[PDB]
Amino acid sequence: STIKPVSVKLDADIKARVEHLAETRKRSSHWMMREAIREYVEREEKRE
Amino acid sequence: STIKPVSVKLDADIKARVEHLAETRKRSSHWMMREAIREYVEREEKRE
Numbered sequence: 464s465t466i467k468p469v470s471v472k473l474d475a476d477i478k479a480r481v482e483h484l485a486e487t488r489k490r491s492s493h494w495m496m497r498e499a500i501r502e503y504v505e506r507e508e509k510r511e
Numbered sequence: 512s513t514i515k516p517v518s519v520k521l522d523a524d525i526k527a528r529v530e531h532l533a534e535t536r537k538r539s540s541h542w543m544m545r546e547a548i549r550e551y552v553e554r555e556e557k558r559e
Contacts, residue, residue, distance in 0.1 A: 503547030
């Protein structure tokens with residue numbers, strides 16, 4: 464399967480807090496946004 | 512500047528389920544990705 468790059472407009476406050484958590488959990492800020500989106504659809508689709 | 516456009520590499524499977532969920536609730540797929548990320552930091556920051 465291929466990958467689709469989507470542009471997400473984030474405010475500077477949320478974007479900075481996402482980058483801080485990745486350094487403290489040795490993750491990458493790009494990986495956590497994917498996991499944030501992935502868990503969002505999984506939770507909300509099982510409620511439909 | 513408090514507006515930063517970030518590119519998130521999403522696979523076609525997650526990219527389609529986010530847009531489908533967005534069509535069924537009339538909020539844009541872009542709005543849910545910002546809310547998906549926002550809830551991730553808020554939940555994970557209270558775990559630190």
